Amino acid sequence: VWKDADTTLFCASDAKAHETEVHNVWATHACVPTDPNPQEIHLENVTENFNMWKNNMVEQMQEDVISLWDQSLQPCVKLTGGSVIKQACPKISFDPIPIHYCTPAGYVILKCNDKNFNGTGPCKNVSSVQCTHGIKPVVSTQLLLNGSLAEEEIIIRSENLTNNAKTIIVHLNKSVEINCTRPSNGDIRKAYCEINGTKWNKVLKQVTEKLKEHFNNKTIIFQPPSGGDLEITMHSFNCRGEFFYCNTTQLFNNTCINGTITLPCKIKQIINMWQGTGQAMYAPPIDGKINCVSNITGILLTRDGGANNTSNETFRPGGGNIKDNWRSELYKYKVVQIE
Ligand SMILES: NC[C@H](NC(=O)c1ccc(-c2ccc(C(F)(F)F)cn2)[nH]1)c1ncc(CO)s1
Ligand SMILES: *[C@@H]1O[C@H](CO)[C@@H](O)[C@H](O)[C@H]1NC(C)=O
Ligand SMILES: *[C@@H]1O[C@H](CO)[C@@H](O)[C@H](O)[C@H]1NC(C)=O
Ligand SMILES: *[C@@H]1O[C@H](CO)[C@@H](O)[C@H](O)[C@H]1NC(C)=O
Ligand SMILES: *[C@@H]1O[C@H](CO)[C@@H](O)[C@H](O)[C@H]1NC(C)=O
Ligand SMILES: *[C@@H]1O[C@H](CO)[C@@H](O)[C@H](O)[C@H]1NC(C)=O
Ligand SMILES: *[C@@H]1O[C@H](CO)[C@@H](O)[C@H](O)[C@H]1NC(C)=O
């Protein structure tokens, strides 16, 4: 017997105390070690309602990631609120590790185990856990990287599909690798990401098939982002401490709905901070081969409005509200207070 409630969670992880990597350093002083013997209990004859779009755990993870980045990254110049802060900017070691979110005494986490659960409504296979699974705090736009996969079918998630201003999270059931590289040998900020077009276009085709099921079999068209800042019009992520911006036009090629797809990328030293606080400048990139191989596990999409009059629906790669990144992993959990 319990009741939905919000409370302050703590974090746990397997951070190494001897590592200089900044996530390990943060988690070493802001998280406790993981519990060696996890205690998950299936709750029999128990149905429970979930709502991933009103889940205070999302707000709490966002606060953690903001804190982590604020004490880890070291721009040479920070421009925020009309002021300018200049400081030392050594190169850092950067590579996310899994963070587990845990309830204090008197509370527990309920976990939805229905494999086609869309994030809202009743769940018939519910268990209780003390902590979530390990979630990597990967900050990206357009593509969700290094996350968990849907266990059966591709899942379309939205707080309201009819409202085109609401972001769509596409949860994939097969990961697709994206392999990004700034080579050793020219223009030191020039990079590229390689994706196996065979695997990708197959998944994309399956994604379009799912979208048809929710939009009454209209024609599904992909278009590049309309406009905005580069962090939004590009797939932006952080690889080894460097800020990558990749052009995803060839990833959403309507015609292919087989060879290697090569996306042009650039590392940028001057960025708009995803925390919303302003602009920051970092030092030039490190020497040598900079390489990140990530698994694409989801896609953020925004649907064009005003198209009811037509027979097609147009989708543009989306993102920017990084909270949706955490929502994509926390959708199956909720906190309750034991009574
Ligand atoms: N120029 C406009 C500005 N947009 C941003 O700040 C913004 C959005 C997303 C990112 C971002 C994403 C990913 C990465 C990384 F590389 F790490 F993956 C870096 N940045 N930045 C604002 N308009 C209004 C606002 C409210 O006050 S904020
Ligand atoms: C999710 O499931 C609920 C309950 O079955 C339904 O009301 C809602 O429309 C669904 N959302 C999507 C995006 O399928
Ligand atoms: C992923 O889901 C699609 C339908 O959404 C299904 O046809 C496909 O077989 C699934 N793939 C895997 C590997 O389960
Ligand atoms: C969903 O969005 C449509 C279009 O904006 C709106 O008319 C409707 O009221 C929304 N539904 C809910 C439950 O907010
Ligand atoms: C990633 O791409 C580079 C080429 O830049 C290649 O050397 C490397 O083997 C690739 N890695 C994987 C896992 O495909
Ligand atoms: C992406 O590439 C296409 C074609 O190369 C180009 O027309 C478009 O402007 C690029 N997008 C951005 C945001 O630079
Ligand atoms: C994704 O995970 C791999 C393996 O740990 C890592 O090398 C890569 O840097 C990660 N990608 C991002 C964007 O953090």
Residue numbers in the entry: 44 to 124, 198 to 301, 324 to 355, 357 to 396, 411 to 492
What text does the study give?
Our group has made significant progress toward meeting this critical need by developing a new class of HIV-1 entry inhibitors (we termed NBDs) targeting the Phe43 cavity of HIV-1 gp120, a different binding site from that targeted by Fostemsavir. NBDs inhibit gp120 binding to the cellular receptor CD4 by direct binding to the Phe43 cavity of HIV-1 envelope glycoprotein gp120. To determine the crystal structures of HIV-1 gp120 core in complex with NBD-14204 or NBD-14208, we used a clade A/E 93TH057 HIV-1 gp120 core with His375 to Ser substitution, which enabled us to produce well-diffracting crystals consistently. The structures revealed that the compounds mimicked the binding of Phe43 of CD4 to gp120 and occupied the cavity in the CD4 binding site of gp120, as shown in previously reported structures of NBD compounds.
The trifluoro-methane group of NBD-14204 in region I contacted Thr257, Glu370, Ile371, and Trp427 with hydrophobic interaction. The nitrogen atom in the pyridine ring made a hydrogen bond to the carbonyl oxygen of Asn425. In addition, the pyrrole ring showed hydrophobic contact in region II with Trp427. Unlike NBD-14204, the nitrogen atom in the pyrrole ring of NBD-14208 made a hydrogen bond to the carbonyl oxygen of Asn425. Both structures showed that their amine groups in region III made hydrogen bonds to Asp368. However, the electron density of region III, particularly their thiazole groups, was poorly defined, even though the two structures were determined with relatively high resolutions of 1.9 Å and 2.1 Å for NBD-14204 and NBD-14208, respectively, indicating that the thiazole rings in the region III are flexible and need to be further optimized to enable the region to make favorable interactions with neighboring residues. However, one key difference is that the pyridine ‘N’ of NBD-14204 interacts with Asn425, whereas the pyrrole ‘N’ of NBD-14208 shows interaction with Asn425. NBD-14204 showed equal antiviral activity against all the clinical isolates tested, including the Rec clones. The IC50 values were in the range of 0.24–0.9 µM with an overall mean of 0.47 ± 0.03 µM, showing slightly better activity against the clinical isolates than against the lab-adapted HIV-1HXB2 (IC50 = 0.96 ± 0.1 µM). The antiviral data indicated that the pyridine-containing compound, NBD-14204, showed about five-fold better antiviral activity than the phenyl-containing compound, NBD-14208. Comparing those values with those obtained with the HIV-1 neutralization assays and calculating the ratios, we can hypothesize that the antiviral activity of NBD-14208 is primarily due to its activity against both gp120 and RT, while the primary activity of NBD-14204 is mostly against gp120 and its activity against RT may just play a secondary role.
